Each structure stands twice: as C-alpha cells, then as structure tokens.
C-alpha cells in the first residue's frame, strides 16, 4: 500500500470513542497506513482535566450546564448565537454532552480526593479535616500545604510526561520498522536512548545515594543515541534532543494550574468565612453574596485556560512525536445524496 497519497482516509472507532474524533479531526487528515491517536485522548484528556480542576461545586455547575444542553438536544432545535457566530446542530450538542459527562465524572472523583468545595470548606463544616483540625476524614492530599505534597505532585506530573513521551516515540519506531521507514525507527530509538540517558543522569544529579547500575545505564543510553545519529548521516538530531528534554519537563503545567485555581478559590472562601466571623450574626449574608459573585467572575475568567492546557498538551507534544503533521492525507468524501 506504498503507492503514494492515493487512498482517501476515513476514521472509525468503538462507540465510546467517537466524540473525540471531533477534537482530533480538524487538525489534519493522517496519511493512510499511519497510526491514529483517536483512542488515546478519551482516556487521557478528561483525566488530566479532573486532576486540574478538582472543584466539586464547579463540577456541579458544569452538570447543570450539561442538563441545559441535554434539554436543548431533547427539544431538537439548533442553538444559535449571532454575537459569537456559532451555529451548531443537536448531534454536536450530544457529542459535547458526552464529553462534559466524562469531564464532570473525572472532576468529581479528583475533587473527592481533593475535598475542597468552592475552596476551603473545613472551617465551616468539619466533614473534611487536617491532622491539625479534627474532622470526619482528613484530606487525603492537602493541595494547599506545598511543604510535602508539592514534591509528590511534580513526581506524578513528570511521570505522566515520561509515559506519554515514550509511548509516542515507540509508536514512531514501530511505524519506522513496519513501513520500511527504517531510518525513522533509527531516529526513534536514538531518541529513546538519549532520553533514558538524560533522565538517569538528572536523577543521579538530583538525588543519588549510590552509583550502582546507573553509570552503565546512561552510558548505554548515550552510546545508543550517538550510534543512531552516526549511521543515519543526518546531523539535525543534536539540538532536537534538548527539544525533547523541553517536552519532558513541559508537563508541570497541570499541577501549576491546579494549585493556582485551588488556592484562589480557597482565598475567596476564606474571605467569605472571615466576613461571616468578624461581622457577627449579619455578616454571613454579605459574605455569601460576595463569595458567590467573585466565584462566578473567576470561573468565567479561568475555565477557558484550564480546559486548554491538557488538550494543548495532547496537541503539540504527542502528535508531533509519532508524526501527525508533516504531511496531509486526502480526506474521504463519497458521491452520495445531499438530502
């Protein structure tokens, strides 16, 4: 099937994986015979959004919005906004409601691990708690105290980064081997060798307690890298490995946005609780009013970027590892009725 760009390309998935084809499709049409990333975004994207937000109250508001959109698709009329120039049909609304259903599922579970409800809530209701302040259950990971939790969280963020990167590189190497693109497999295996070398070297340079197998580990990694560069005769590979290093350490943004949003919400609710406590009996009304209004302004301000970071992480990084972009595929179109 190596007869050039001849074959039109169409995509199909299991029924749960169809809604994410909307997200992945509009970037580019892949070449025929190339692996498609369509099953990877269903499992990864709402997972990352869930660890990002973790706000139960905003998840409930998103569920209310989803109820509004499901009512819209039930009445089966198109939704039109002339101000923003969007006309969309009910089926796209259904695909979006599937997305937000999975979205609020992951948001809710990550929120119950991250028990903060509209920010700090344990001061008013002791269902959650700390070792300091008694409660029904302690917060499993208190994502306010950066003294101990921060290191663990950057560890999982960097772990997600590692997993995603060698998955993409292994896909690239697999395609290079299978399609007789043998040099592409060489580039991929050189990337894997260089990457394991630099990560082992960084782990030794940061927290080593003994040399052991590690010296042979990065020596083998760098040897694989320089051999793969050497016989391939292409010298562009050298700065591109620090480009990959940047792609590895680019994954801290999920923890960063989560900490920022949660601490902002906690400060807002702390202001509300302080207003309730200081003013006495009547302060709770003004405190709740101001808490709700600043909560709404901050949500319509911040929910766009929080949504953008994980899908961006899927877009720029993963699709460029295996080779999504460098050629366009011919789209599929049948000669059938317009109806």
């Amino acid at each position: 099937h190596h007869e050039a760009d001849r074959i039109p390309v169409v995509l199909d998935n299991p029924p749960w994986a169809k809604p994410f084809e909307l997200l992945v499709s509009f970037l580019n049409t892949p070449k025929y015979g190339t692996f498609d990333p369509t099953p990877v975004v269903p499992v990864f994207f709402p997972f990352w959004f869930g660890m990002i937000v973790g706000d139960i109250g905003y998840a409930l508001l998103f569920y209310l919005v989803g109820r509004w959109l499901s009512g819209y698709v039930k009445r089966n009329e198109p939704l039109v906004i002339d101000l923003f120039a969007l006309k969309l049909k009910p089926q796209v609304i259904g695909k979006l409601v599937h997305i937000l259903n999975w979205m609020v599922f992951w948001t809710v579970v990550w929120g119950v691990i991250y028990g903060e409800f509209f920010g700090t809530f344990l001061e008013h209701l002791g269902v959650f708690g700390t070792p300091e302040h008694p409660g029904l259950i302690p917060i499993l990971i208190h994502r306010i105290d950066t003294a101990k939790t921060a290191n663990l969280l950057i560890l999982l963020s960097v772990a997600f980064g590692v997993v995603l990167v060698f998955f993409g590189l292994a896909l690239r190497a697999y395609l290079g081997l299978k399609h007789r693109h043998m040099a592409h497999f060489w580039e991929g295996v050189g990337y894997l060798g260089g990457l394991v070398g630099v990560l082992a070297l960084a782990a030794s340079y940061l927290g080593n307690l003994q040399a052991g197998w590690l010296q042979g580990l990065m020596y083998l990694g760098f040897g694989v890298f320089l051999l793969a560069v050497l016989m391939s005769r292409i010298w562009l590979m050298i700065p591109e490995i620090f480009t990959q290093a940047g792609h590895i350490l680019s994954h801290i943004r999920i923890y960063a946005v989560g900490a920022a949003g949660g601490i902002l919400a906690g400060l807002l609710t702390d202001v509300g609780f302080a207003l309730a406590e200081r003013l006495g009996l009547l302060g709770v009304l003004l405190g709740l009013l101001v808490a709700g209004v600043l909560h709404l302004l901050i949500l319509l301000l911040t929910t766009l970027g929080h949504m953008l970071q994980p899908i961006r992480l899927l877009w720029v990084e993963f699709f460029t590892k295996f080779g999504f972009y460098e050629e366009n595929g011919r789209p599929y179109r049948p000669f059938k009725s317009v109806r």
Binding site: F84, A85, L86, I252, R253, Y255, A256, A259, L308, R312
Partner: protein, 73 residues
C-alpha cells in the same frame, strides 16, 4: 532572627511580576492580530481564541516558582 522572609517575598514577587510582563508583551501582538483577522471574517473565532490563550504558560510557571518558594515559610 534573620530577615530571610522578606527577601524570599521579594524573590517570589519579582518572579511572578516578570512572568506577567512577558505574557503581556506576547498577548498584545497576539490579540491585535487576532482582532484584525476577526474584523474581516467571523468564522476565524476559534483559532484566534486558541492562539490568544496559548501564552499563559509563562505566568503559570511563575506562580509555580512562587508557591515552591512559599513552601519555605
């Protein structure tokens, strides 16, 4: 006791402020070209908003530096 607390406070503030400056200079030209593209055709709405909402990353790492230094308190 030493005066280290105010000095690390100066450090975090400097970090977040310069990150804010960098993304401001980015967003200026990004949004200017985005509005220029929008005024001729309204179908380019989505791409303009994604391209404007890319450069937040620098202030996100600036605040990340801010809380990792805040953990020293």
């Amino acid at each position: 006791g030493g005066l280290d607390r105010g000095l690390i406070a100066v450090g975090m503030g400097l970090a977040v402020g310069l990150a804010a400056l960098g993304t401001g200079v980015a967003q200026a030209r990004i949004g200017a070209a985005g509005v220029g593209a929008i005024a001729e055709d309204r179908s380019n709405f989505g791409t303009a908003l994604i391209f404007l909402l890319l450069p937040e990353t620098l202030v996100i790492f600036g605040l990340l530096i801010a809380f990792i230094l805040n953990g020293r308190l």
